[PDB]
Amino acid sequence: NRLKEKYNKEIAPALMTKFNYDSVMQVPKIEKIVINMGVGDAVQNAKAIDSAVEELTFIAGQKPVVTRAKKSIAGFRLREGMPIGAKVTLRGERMYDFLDKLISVSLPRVRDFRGVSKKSFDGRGNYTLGIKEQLIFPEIDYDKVTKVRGMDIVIVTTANTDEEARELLTQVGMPF
Amino acid sequence: MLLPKRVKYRREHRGKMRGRAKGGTEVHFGEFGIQALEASWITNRQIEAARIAMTRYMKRGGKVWIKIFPSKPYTAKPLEVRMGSGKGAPEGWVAVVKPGKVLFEISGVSEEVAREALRLASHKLPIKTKFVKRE
Amino acid sequence: MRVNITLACTECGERNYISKKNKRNNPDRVEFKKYCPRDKKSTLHRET
């Protein structure tokens, strides 16, 4: 919200001038911020996913969906039909409300921090985070936490190449 | 001794031979080649013997090309048995060679020695042959 | 295993339909709604 208004006011004009897009609305934009959860279950502990779901709901703004595994694999003893992982999508005002928490408090609150992954990009503007702890905002009832597994986080943009997204994330406020 | 490392079936019809070869009728990789002017079968032992008769004589002169593969197996019932009651086991691989097919080709070697060496090897094959060279 | 069964009804005793079923999957006495001929309408058919 705050960020978004700022996105309308300062970010889009600045980088539109910096790249010379003839059409203004061609400017890159964050499309979605999506969360994935994965629990080594195959089932290892049936309560693991049944805990991760309603901790991730607090972490995000709304309930996730339990991911239905695609195909069976005996390497992990993962039979097809035993649920693993959970997903929640975020967009609209919610994605900016989420990025707000992240950039302002979460990354600086990591057990240790330096500049985020230098070349985590995929190649076409998408970009991913691997954060190991659930310490995202400090008011989680953090004493509840038994397992320490953090989040897999993907930010998806309308960028067509890595350079523009790299530049955009700067004034969005991500360190590198 | 060219084994096909695998095959879809280990038994199939003997088939028939009619007309010229479908492809590979002229030299394509070597300076000179050898051609067969009637239809017949050709087996691992034949190609192996001819190959050795070629290369061991030619020594360091160059390289020899083989355009043949005995993908076809052929069966034979066990010795001393009444015929019938199931196709016999397979014990050899064979390559169909219609007339016009060029079998072997030589590269990087003088003309006369290739001529006489191909003549030498031809006696290993059971088939009337004709010397042939690239256009 | 699949075992034969004949269907029955409470609206009227006369019932005729047959079917197959798995004991493991349906241990309970199953119900279907079907057209009884002699009652000349649709009714709820149990099994015997």
Binding site: E31, V156, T158, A159, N160 | - | -
Partner: protein
Amino acid sequence: MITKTSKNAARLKRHARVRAKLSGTAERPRLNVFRSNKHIYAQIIDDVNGVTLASASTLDKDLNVESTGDTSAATKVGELVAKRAAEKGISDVVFDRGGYLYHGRVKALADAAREAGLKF
């Protein structure tokens, strides 16, 4: 950018799916709908000869409203196309949603046609 398929492109597949089952013959023509962002179109089509019979639209040259695309416009255009069928009266048609979902302005149009008396 993220490969977003055209909305009309997605709609065309559904429209072809539904069209596969039915079409409007002589004395049993087919109604059709376009649910454009800014306008609503209606058409009475005879498949076999490949020509329309009568049509109606929000941007028709009379009876306009500031809606021109909302449910009120759908009702008005529906009764309009009902009259446009009436003068060369057909009295029956096979409905065919334009690969849409029968809940909204399409329902308003269908209700208008029915109450006007085009027996589906």
